Amino acid sequence: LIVNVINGPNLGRLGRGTTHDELVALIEREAAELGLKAVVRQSDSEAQLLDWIHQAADAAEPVILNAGGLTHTSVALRDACAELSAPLIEVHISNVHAREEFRRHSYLSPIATGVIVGLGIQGYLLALRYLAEH
Amino acid sequence: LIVNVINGPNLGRLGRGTTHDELVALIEREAAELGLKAVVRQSDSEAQLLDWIHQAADAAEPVILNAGGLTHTSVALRDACAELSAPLIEVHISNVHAREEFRRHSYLSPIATGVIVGLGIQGYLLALRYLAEH
Amino acid sequence: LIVNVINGPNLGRLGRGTTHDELVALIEREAAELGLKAVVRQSDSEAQLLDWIHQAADAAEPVILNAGGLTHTSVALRDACAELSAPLIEVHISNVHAREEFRRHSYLSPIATGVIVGLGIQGYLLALRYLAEH
Amino acid sequence: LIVNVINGPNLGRLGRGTTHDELVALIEREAAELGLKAVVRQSDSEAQLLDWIHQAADAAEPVILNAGGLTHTSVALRDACAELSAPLIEVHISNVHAREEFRRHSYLSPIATGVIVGLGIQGYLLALRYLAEH
Amino acid sequence: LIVNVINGPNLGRLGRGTTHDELVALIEREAAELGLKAVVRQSDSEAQLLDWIHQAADAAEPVILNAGGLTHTSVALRDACAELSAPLIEVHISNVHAREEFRRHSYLSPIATGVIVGLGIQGYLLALRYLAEH
Amino acid sequence: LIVNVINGPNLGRLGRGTTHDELVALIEREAAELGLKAVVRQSDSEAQLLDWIHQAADAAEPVILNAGGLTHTSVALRDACAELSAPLIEVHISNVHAREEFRRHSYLSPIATGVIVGLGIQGYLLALRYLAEH
Amino acid sequence: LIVNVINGPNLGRLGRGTTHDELVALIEREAAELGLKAVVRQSDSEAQLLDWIHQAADAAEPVILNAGGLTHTSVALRDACAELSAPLIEVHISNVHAREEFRRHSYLSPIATGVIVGLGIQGYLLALRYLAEH
Amino acid sequence: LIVNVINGPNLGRLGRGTTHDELVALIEREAAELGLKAVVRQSDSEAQLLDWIHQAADAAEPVILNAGGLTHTSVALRDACAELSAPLIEVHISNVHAREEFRRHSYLSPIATGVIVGLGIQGYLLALRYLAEH
Amino acid sequence: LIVNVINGPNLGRLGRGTTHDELVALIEREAAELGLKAVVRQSDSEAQLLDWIHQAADAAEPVILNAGGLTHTSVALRDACAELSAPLIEVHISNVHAREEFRRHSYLSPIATGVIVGLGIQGYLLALRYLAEH
Amino acid sequence: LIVNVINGPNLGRLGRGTTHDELVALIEREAAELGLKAVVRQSDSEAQLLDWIHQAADAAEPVILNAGGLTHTSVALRDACAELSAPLIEVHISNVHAREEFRRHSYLSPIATGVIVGLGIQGYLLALRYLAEH
Amino acid sequence: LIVNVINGPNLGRLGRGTTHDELVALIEREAAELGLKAVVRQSDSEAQLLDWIHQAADAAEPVILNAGGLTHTSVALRDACAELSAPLIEVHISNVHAREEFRRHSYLSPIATGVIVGLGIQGYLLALRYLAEH
Amino acid sequence: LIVNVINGPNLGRLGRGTTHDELVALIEREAAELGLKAVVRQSDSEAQLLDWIHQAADAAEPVILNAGGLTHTSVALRDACAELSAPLIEVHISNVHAREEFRRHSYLSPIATGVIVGLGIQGYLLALRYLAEH
Ligand SMILES: CC1(C)C(=O)[C@@H](O)[C@H](O)C[C@]1(O)C(=O)O
Ligand SMILES: CC1(C)C(=O)[C@@H](O)[C@H](O)C[C@]1(O)C(=O)O
Ligand SMILES: CC1(C)C(=O)[C@@H](O)[C@H](O)C[C@]1(O)C(=O)O
Ligand SMILES: CC1(C)C(=O)[C@@H](O)[C@H](O)C[C@]1(O)C(=O)O
Ligand SMILES: CC1(C)C(=O)[C@@H](O)[C@H](O)C[C@]1(O)C(=O)O
Ligand SMILES: CC1(C)C(=O)[C@@H](O)[C@H](O)C[C@]1(O)C(=O)O
Ligand SMILES: CC1(C)C(=O)[C@@H](O)[C@H](O)C[C@]1(O)C(=O)O
Ligand SMILES: CC1(C)C(=O)[C@@H](O)[C@H](O)C[C@]1(O)C(=O)O
Ligand SMILES: CC1(C)C(=O)[C@@H](O)[C@H](O)C[C@]1(O)C(=O)O
Ligand SMILES: CC1(C)C(=O)[C@@H](O)[C@H](O)C[C@]1(O)C(=O)O
Ligand SMILES: CC1(C)C(=O)[C@@H](O)[C@H](O)C[C@]1(O)C(=O)O
Ligand SMILES: CC1(C)C(=O)[C@@H](O)[C@H](O)C[C@]1(O)C(=O)O
Ligand code: NA
Ligand code: NA
Ligand code: NA
Ligand code: NA
Ligand code: NA
Ligand code: NA
Ligand code: NA
Ligand code: NA
Ligand code: NA
Ligand code: NA
Ligand code: NA
Ligand code: NA
Ligand code: NA
Ligand code: NA
Ligand code: NA
Ligand code: NA
Ligand code: NA
Ligand code: NA
Ligand code: NA
Ligand code: NA
Ligand code: NA
Ligand code: NA
Ligand code: NA
Ligand code: NA
Ligand code: NA
Ligand code: NA
Ligand code: NA
Ligand code: NA
Ligand code: NA
Ligand code: NA
Ligand code: NA
Ligand code: NA
Ligand code: NA
Ligand code: NA
Ligand code: NA
Ligand code: NA
């Protein structure tokens, strides 16, 4: 039923095409179509992201996570995500493999159920659809 | 309209859960639902895979590619895929980031539109859905 | 007399065996037995940890620090800890050397007085005992 | 006209020679002499630094940035700084090349207009003078 | 009841502060206070160290081990230590992380229960106290 | 009073914008304004550069050095520069961190007082101003 | 009873001492002496090797494999070999450790039961003898 | 007299400027002018390339080889080429040193007589001319 | 006629399945069957192993060597083994390639005639059989 | 019309077979046959080589360059060569890929039109022929 | 007056040219000529070498040390040698830089006064002469 | 009879203890005592050093070479030195192994007869004595 979509640093700057408010609206609409409720949250603060992941761990709710630059750098976020019992889908809007070498390593991928990159904002919608069939 | 799904070495051994024939049937059914025609092919021969990629290049048809172990090893396959003008979506059934370090490098990812890993056979269906909306 | 025990990200999630509140109680009891006063604080926010380290620097108070994942990643925390004049003991509950390779590097160890790993929550109590004899 | 000077973690601890309040006063005085207005801000919180960089991006204002330890570690800060359209000058008080090897890599340098290191607090004043002539 | 304390090469040269004979006396006194019997042995010969570890394996006795330079170099010692069923605590007098890079790798740490470094000879006494509570 | 500005290989090719003769004129004008005398010299010969550095060592005169490609390659030049007692400021016109990886290492930076990169020819003028206040 | 001996690229060129036909005859003779039936096959085509490995997986038959240069390069072959339930013995005629560094890594060794190198064609016969006693 | 020109994977796709059929015609014309007979063959199959190299080894005929992506990846092809007694000239149309780092390593170069890169299809003609004078 | 079997550190601990005394008995029985005399020796002391290798060098006798952890670490043992004129077969009971990365390098393999790993104690018997046919 | 052939350090020592004077004569003869004028120069001085490259840049003349050991070491020479507008062909007499690993990296190759190695002094003549057809 | 010459593993095998007994005689003769007394000792046992180094530390006597393979591998020997107050000269008979890469690193060189390699047994005599003038 | 002593960049700056003129005098005196003639030359120019090495190659005269920083950087100097038929002794005044890591690699050591480091100016005199006995 409930799916958490958690966006990390700089994702509030989307579109400055699709803005973060637009993304929320798109996700909510898709979720309803699939019979799910999407809770979409964004923060530039690692501590706030950690708190949202802790809550999803306690509730056994799935998480779709685009951690922004913290993907590549945060062991703390990995440690929190490792506690999740429900699925964790990592999403990147851009194809990180076509950019700098440092973007090709993720602390999150090894502990995620799966990873979608380079499909733009549709990545989020495809992750929802995976969770609805699972 | 037409989407090519190309599976590389050892993918004929799926299920020995879901068999390769079953996967073909699942993909075909999903494609029809989306208004697409899926052409699904599998080979253990790099040369045969190259030929199928060349044909998709000449026809300007999108490709969903699970190259199996060649993902990690074949520059020749990368070179062929670089010629494609329509989208290229790389799919892995397993989460390659939760396995050996060598599986975490792909010669294909940098030249793909995007990459889906770890979502099992649903990865193929989600890639179809991306192409139908694009 | 006064010893600061500072716990970083995810340490509030201990026990979800020993909870963080239990750990506080254990530390306080041991401190009193040794003739010390323990001030035990936890935060998921790097900025908050930095502030507590700055205060210990200004007061010339010893610090027992379990920085969680920031151990492996934060130069900022190292820089703050380098200002401490009293002893700094790094503690990890788990044996970081029996886990992923990335956990085997610490930005803090080179600037600490010493390091205790893998002795569970007793590590904290043993660090207190070192400080009481020093 | 307006230049933002942004100082990151631990820079509030300057002088505990020149204190952070003194640095602000020095910068403001130099700015006025050059016909500029300097807005000088410091934070130990990455999220707060990100917000200030976002604002400078939206206003098309130049930034002089001493990110402290985040220089070496934060992809998130790089990503925010990449959005700036006006110049970005990276400043370090110390000569990072005469210290530990890890300080010799910066996530910011590749995206900065230029970089001044090792000239102490005069680095800030020299960066102002560059911006006044540009 | 019985704890073996095993010191490797060059540890007989302690104090030429605290000498190796003094260390033995300190350990024995602490052990008695904790209700334990400490058997403290030192050798510069890897073969002799191996024999003492084999005996502790056969007797299921805990070991506190400061292997000196062999920490960094001996796979043979690791292999012997891997046979121990009771706890193994690695101790270094100095903080190996504040010295040459080569001292920051240990063949023993991954197979130890835990590791104490940089607390001087008190490290041995703290390891005894861990074993008495375990 | 006297400051030496030493330019290495290929710097005579500046402008083929600002030519090397123009740069000399700009530097001389700025120096006079600051109450300094600038001696500006350029050579493509490492031996000649070494001789000029030796002379500045013997006279205890400050040096502003843009060694061109020798920055990245010459231990001999580092060794000569290490003898200087007065300040040494390394200047690069381009932002070397936005170019090939090999340009991001300098044999000179560790032994320089400070380093200015990416501010174009103004880097030289800013280095003069540092020396006038020091 | 049945053992498959599979030789990869360039092994048909043996002796141009012992030729590949001679090797087949030697293996067959040894197999009969041990009460086994040896099926010896060679191909320069990875796809053909994969097919033979798939068949041995389906039949639960042991495999003695000299993959030639594919040893060092093929993840696809590793993936096929990982499916085998009966033993897999890797054989090299030459001592790969006395040659180029690249020959000292094998994608197959980690998944093999064991590995024999440098014993010439007797390696094959010794592998047969292992399988007869197992 | 006879020279073999062997082209590997994707070289049949030349011109989709100069097509592979055109290249054959150009080579044949140049060969005749030099008093040579050129046998030009292309395949996307490693096994087929191996067979052609084996035949050139048996006939003691020179080889001009553009192995395409296999240059960078195939130990099997190196092993076959090592058997050649007549000269082996490696040719690349593109300048592999101006592309991705992975293209700057060749398994073939160490065993070739020489290597021509970046001179386009004229590289083949220049290799013929070398063989005619040798 | 005479073959030396030399076992290094920790091999006396075999079976605490097959014990070291049992292994000796098995080897002796196999040797007699092959018309050989096996001299089997074990030591945890590198110096003692060196002496036995020196004696085999002086007598021009073949050696089957399982150096235990010294395989991975001892240049001294390599240097002694390099003096042997008769064959040297390296044996490991376990498949070192399926364990830690550090076990995948041997100082001995490059100087050995050949290497058998992962075939358990039968490895020793197979090495004897090689020497009997050679 | 005019082609510069520039030889770097130690190339004056050719033949102490073909001497440097002989090479000049061979090149001049070939050039005339092709309708070109070859200007062949050699120096052991990097500064002198730089000057000759600067002149070829100013005249928009092609360069055939064998930089000797500077190939592997000089960023200054790369920087000068990057200014050339006409083609730059790098030539090595020896096959650098069959020698020490350090010879397999060139600072020049990425900025050259193409590279010929291992064809002896004919490499120079083949480079002339490329330039005559281009 | 007294100089210790300490030879490590395998040095007793010299000449099986100059034997170890001959070397002793040569050293003793040279020492007497210089007014010194040479005590020359050899062992294959690290523990024995450590003891001899400890004694030289306690007596403040200079040491000429050829540690054989332990040069490259023993931190324990480095640690003992670091205690010496009188000079320490490292000697190798062979030129270790012309052999395998692993021989080009020494744990001893950084703590030695100096190092002589590749001058054969004369290296020992030259080291004596250094000590006589110092 | 004749020995060349060649000093590279910055060696003319010795003593600004022993000056370069003093070193020449010391060497000449020692040479005469040994029945040799020493020709001692110094230059900061690589080209000049190359010329002196070429002359020693042509005359078959031994060389004692302290190349200064070029030791670590010049392939050209290595190439010239490789031509020498008489002995080549590399000398460093300082112990390069006790300094920066980059000083621990020499392009010259592999091609030298031997190497003396860290014995100060006596290194030169000891090298002369080696050549007199050889
Ligand atoms: C571009 C984004 C949002 C980002 O912040 C980067 O640091 C990251 O490498 C990729 C990213 O998460 C994305 O493409 O979604
Ligand atoms: C398991 C598959 C099919 C494979 O062949 C592996 O080599 C590859 O690393 C991952 C893979 O492509 C997949 O999970 O789809
Ligand atoms: C498990 C803890 C708390 C942690 O957060 C990890 O990131 C770290 O590697 C180890 C750790 O600090 C610990 O074991 O105390
Ligand atoms: C010393 C400062 C402020 C810092 O925090 C360090 O992490 C950084 O490497 C250098 C630094 O930014 C500086 O010198 O300004
Ligand atoms: C200093 C000691 C004893 C030692 O022998 C070193 O090799 C090791 O790195 C650290 C050490 O074990 C210690 O500090 O106890
Ligand atoms: C471009 C310059 C002058 C140069 O020669 C390069 O080798 C160097 O990497 C940067 C440089 O010194 C500069 O930008 O001033
Ligand atoms: C020599 C062989 C057959 C081979 O093809 C090489 O690529 C490989 O490194 C070793 C090899 O498999 C062998 O020695 O059997
Ligand atoms: C472009 C070609 C043909 C190729 O297939 C690449 O994999 C290779 O790196 C270079 C290449 O062989 C060539 O430029 O001829
Ligand atoms: C397990 C043995 C005996 C050993 O001591 C390890 O150090 C080595 O990596 C492998 C080993 O020699 C063996 O498996 O025979
Ligand atoms: C042998 C030559 C001339 C040379 O000086 C080497 O440093 C270089 O690696 C190769 C070389 O340029 C050549 O083969 O032409
Ligand atoms: C050859 C010697 C004696 C040795 O034992 C090697 O391990 C070492 O690399 C060099 C050596 O010490 C020597 O040449 O004196
Ligand atoms: C100090 C010297 C002269 C030098 O120039 C350095 O570059 C080199 O690393 C060591 C040196 O050659 C020496 O100590 O003789
Ligand atoms: Na929720
Ligand atoms: Na990871
Ligand atoms: Na999209
Ligand atoms: Na199709
Ligand atoms: Na890639
Ligand atoms: Na699925
Ligand atoms: Na407090
Ligand atoms: Na560190
Ligand atoms: Na505990
Ligand atoms: Na502002
Ligand atoms: Na970067
Ligand atoms: Na300042
Ligand atoms: Na005991
Ligand atoms: Na380890
Ligand atoms: Na202590
Ligand atoms: Na001057
Ligand atoms: Na450096
Ligand atoms: Na400028
Ligand atoms: Na079969
Ligand atoms: Na592997
Ligand atoms: Na054989
Ligand atoms: Na043919
Ligand atoms: Na190679
Ligand atoms: Na062309
Ligand atoms: Na014997
Ligand atoms: Na080796
Ligand atoms: Na067995
Ligand atoms: Na010209
Ligand atoms: Na390059
Ligand atoms: Na030639
Ligand atoms: Na003595
Ligand atoms: Na070292
Ligand atoms: Na000698
Ligand atoms: Na001379
Ligand atoms: Na070298
Ligand atoms: Na001296």
Q: In chain C, where does DSSP find H-type helix? A: 20-33, 46-59, 75-81, 122-133
Active site residue F20: no
C106 touches chain D (CB under 8 A): no
Task: Give one word for F15, left, alpha or beta, with left for phi > 0 and alpha for psi -120 to 50.
Answer: left
Q: How many Å from the N-terminal Cα to the C-terminal Cα in chain I?
A: 11
Asked whether B8 and B80 are in contact (CB, 8 A), the reply is no
User: Contact J71/J93 with Cβ under 8 angstroms?
Assistant: no
Question: Which of helix, strand or coil describes residue F56?
Answer: helix
What kind and span of H or E run contains K64? strand K63-66
Kindly list the strands in the beta sheet with K88-92, ordered across the sheet, starting from the edge strand earlier in the chain.
K37-42, K2-7, K63-66, K88-92, K114-117, L114-117, L88-92, L63-66, L2-7, L37-42
Alpha-carbon gap, residue C104 to E13, rounded angstroms: 30
SS3 call for C84: coil
Q: Does F46 touch chain L (CB under 8 A)?
A: yes
Using DSSP's 3-state secondary structure scheme, residue E118 falls into coil
Technique used by the depositors = X-ray
CA distance L4 to L38: 6
Ligand 21 centre and the CA of C119: distance in Å?
A: 5
Mutate to test the pocket of ligand 8, among B50, B73, B79 (most ligand atoms within 8 A of CB): B79
For F87, how many CA atoms within 13 A lie in the half-sphere containing its CB?
A: 22
Shortest Cα distance, chain D CAs vs residue C96, angstroms: 21
Q: What is the distance between the terminal CA atoms of chain A, rounded to a whole angstrom?
A: 11
Nearest partner of L51 among L25, L76, L28, L73, judged by Cα: L76
Contact (CB, 8 A) for F116 and D116? yes
Phi, psi for A18 (deg, rounded to 5): -65, 125
CB-side neighbour CA atoms (13 Å) of I68: 24
Chains J and A in direct contact, meaning 3 or more beta-carbon pairs closer than 8 angstroms: no
Instruction: Determine phi and psi for K86, rounding to 5 degrees.
Output: -85, 170
**Token representation of residue A40:** 């979409």
Closest listed residue to residue H54, CA positions, set G48, B57, G44: G44
Q: How far is CA K66 from CA D127, K19, K42, in A?
A: 56, 15, 9
- What is d(CA H118, CA J63) in angstroms, rounded to the nearest whole number? 15
C101 Cβ neighbours under 8 A, 6+ residues apart: none
Nearest alpha-carbon partner for J62 in J114, J9, J10: J114
Beta strand D63-66 with D88-92 is: parallel
- Angle between helix axes C122-133 and E122-133 (nearest 10 degrees) is 140
Contacts (Cβ under 8 Å, ≥6 apart) of D79: A9, A10, A68, A69
Residue D69 Cα to ligand 13 midpoint, Å, equals: 34
Pocket test for ligand 3, best of A46, A77, A79 (most atoms within 8 A of CB): A79
Q: Which residues of A touch B126 (CB under 8 A)?
A: 116, 126, 129-130
What DSSP designation does F92 have?
E
Q: Which chains touch K (3 or more CB pairs under 8 A)?
A: E, I, L
If you write DSSP's letter for every residue of G70-124 in order, what string do you get? GGGT-HHHHHHHTT--S-EEEEESS-GGGS-GGGG--SSTTTSSEEEESSTTHHH
The residues, any chain, with a CB within 8 Å of residue B99's CB and separated by 6 or more, are: none
For E68, the closest of K51, K79, K83 (CB atoms) is K79
d(CA J84, CA B120): 53
Look at the alpha carbons of K40, K46, K47, K51 in this order and tell me if their dihedral is positive or negative. Answer: positive
Tokens coding F64: 């502003």
Measured in angstroms, the CA of E22 and the nearest CA of chain C are apart by 17
- Residues I123/I25, Cβ–Cβ less than 8 Å: no
Query: Between β-strands L114-117 and K114-117, what pairing exists: parallel, antiparallel or unpaired?
Result: antiparallel
Q: Which two tokens stand for residue A98?
A: 């076509």
- Kindly identify which residue of chain A lies nearest to residue B122, measuring between CA atoms: A130
CA nearest to J13, candidates L55, L88, L8, L7: L55
Tokens of A30: 């898709």
| DSSP codes joined into one string, D63-87 | EEEE-GGGGGT-HHHHHHHTT--S-
Q: Does residue K122's CB lie within 6 angstroms of at least one atom of ligand 11?
A: no
Check if the beta carbon of residue A46 is closer than 8 Å to that of residue A79: no
Mutual angle of helices C122-133 and C20-33, in 10-degree steps = 30
Determine contact, residues D23/D81, Cβ cutoff 8 Å: no
Residue G113 CA to ligand 29 centre (angstroms):
47
Q: How far is the CA of L105 from the centre of ligand 47 (A)?
A: 7
Pairing of strands A114-117, B114-117: antiparallel
Q: DSSP assignment, residue K119?
A: S
The Cα J78–Cα J105 span in angstroms is 13
Q: H/E/C letters for each residue in I82-130?
A: CCCCCCEEEEECCCHHHCCHHHHCCCCCCCCCEEEECCCCHHHHHHHHH
Beta-carbon contacts of residue L3 (< 8 Å; ≥ 6 apart) = L31, L36, L37, L38, L39, L61, L62, L63, L64, L128, L131
Beta carbons of D4 and D56 less than 8 angstroms apart: yes
Give residues with Cβ within 8 angstroms of E114, minimum separation 6: C95, C116, C117, C118, C119, C123, E89, E90, E130
Resolution in A: 1.6
Helices (H), B9-121: 20-33, 46-59, 75-81
Q: Report the candidate in F115, J47, F113, L76 with the shortest Cα–Cα distance to residue F105.
A: F115
Measure the CA–CA gap between F108 and F105, rounded to whole angstroms: 9
Q: From residue J117, how far is each of C13, G60, H117, J92, K32 by CA, in Å? A: 63, 51, 9, 5, 58
- H51 residue type, one letter: D
DSSP state, residue D108? S
**J16 — contact with chain L (CB < 8 Å)?**
yes
The closest residue, in CA terms, to atom 3 on ligand 2 is B68
| Residue L49 amino acid letter | L
I97:G106 CB<8 A: yes
**CB neighbours (10 Å) of residue I83?**
15
DSSP character for C74? -
B82–A contact, CB cutoff 8 A: no
Q: What domains can be seen in chain J, in order of their start residue? A: 1-134 (3.40.50.9100)
**K109 in contact with L, Cβ within 8 Å:** yes
Determine the Cα–Cα distance for residues L125 and I21; give it in Å rounded to an integer. 60
By C-alpha distance, the chain I residue nearest K69 is I76
Residues F88 and F67: their CA atoms lie apart, in Å, by: 12
Verify D-J touch: 3 or more CB pairs within 8 A.
no
3-class DSSP string for chain J:
CEEEEEECCCHHHCCCCCCHHHHHHHHHHHHHHCCCEEEEEECCCHHHHHHHHHHHHHHCCCEEEECHHHHHCCHHHHHHHCCCCCCEEEEECCCHHHCCHHHHCCCCCCCCCEEEECCCCHHHHHHHHHHHHC
Specify the residue for token string 């025990």.
C5
* Bridge partners of residue L115, in order along the sequence: K117, L90
D9 contacts in C (CB within 8 Å)? 46-47, 50, 76, 79-80
Whole-angstrom distance, CA of residue C2 vs CA of residue C52: 14
G33: distance to nearest CA of chain H, Å? Answer: 33
In eight-state DSSP terms, residue I34 is T
- The tally of CA atoms less than 13 A away on the side-chain side of residue A69 is 21
Compute φ and ψ for L3, nearest 5 degrees.
Answer: -125, 130
Q: Which of J94, J95, J102, J119 to mutate to test the pocket of ligand 10 (most atoms within 8 A of CB)?
A: J94
Long-range Cβ pairs for the range I41-44 (8 Å, 24+):
I41/I4, I41/I5, I41/I6, I41/I7, I42/I6, I42/I7, I42/I8, I42/I11, I42/I12, I43/E47, I43/I7, I43/I8, I43/I9, I44/E46, I44/E47, I44/E50, I44/E51, I44/E76, I44/I8, I44/I9, I44/I10, I44/I12
Contacts of L9 in chain F (CB under 8 A): 46-47, 50, 76, 79-80
Is K134 marked within a binding site? no
CA of E18 to the centre of ligand 35 (A): 55
> How far H52 CA sits from the closest chain J CA (Å)?
23
B29 touching A, CB under 8 A? no
Ligand 12 contact via L103 beta carbon (within 6 Å): yes
Cα–Cα dist B58/B112, whole Å: 17
